[PDB]
Design a protein around this ligand. Sequence first.
Ligand SMILES: NS(=O)(=O)c1ccc(B(O)O)cc1
Ligand SMILES: [Zn+2]
Length: 257
Amino acid sequence: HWGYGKHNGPEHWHKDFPIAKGERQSPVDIDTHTAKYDPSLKPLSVSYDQATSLRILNNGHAFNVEFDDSQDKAVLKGGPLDGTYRLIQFHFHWGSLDGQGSEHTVDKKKYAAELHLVHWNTKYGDFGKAVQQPDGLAVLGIFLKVGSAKPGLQKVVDVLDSIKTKGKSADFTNFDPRGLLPESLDYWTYPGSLTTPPLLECVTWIVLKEPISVSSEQVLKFRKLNFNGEGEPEELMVDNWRPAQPLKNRQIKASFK
Ligand SMILES: NS(=O)(=O)c1ccc(B(O)O)cc1
Ligand SMILES: [Zn+2]
């Protein structure tokens, strides 16, 4: 099946997932000189005060930190969004080197990694229903650059040794996602898709302008993960990012003038 190698990577996906060539695919390059300030954007509200993480899982493409989404405990509201979106998981995309790894790019600049906080619209009852709708998902994207260490990431970093290979999971309770946010919540927003198969066009993308800084040692531990399962030839989990897709007729709006 699909992956990120030379023979199953992003350029192959359209053979099994024809929507890969659709009209609102993600990620995209963010042209900062063409994104327009939108005064019609309400303030963005990240309410992670009562977030309840459960588990961390290596799914052979990335690792997911999974949250209890049975109640409105961690929710995203406001900005371009109508209603309440519940946090279900977060994960990262990263590169083999610090000059690549992010999915979105900013004036063609690639960051070392990108964090995706994935939320689903409560009006559709559950995640599986939401991804079938144009406004089903909201994904908050946060760029990572290599610099000083991110203390709020270290709990994630420390547990990766226990989920090295595909299918491994570990208990991951009392993790506070607020420690992964930058100082400012200025953002760009546009309508797009999941960036991995099934590539469904169901995402309101909210991409923060300000990156967070992580240490070289921290990203180094990301790169020690494996795509493969236990007891198999080792493939380091690196470069698990999809490149920028054509913007087509979409407009990127900026929350900041
Ligand atoms: N990388 S992303 O946030 O756009 C994403 C999130 C979820 C799924 B999925 O549930 O298959 C795929 C891609
Ligand atoms: Zn992602």
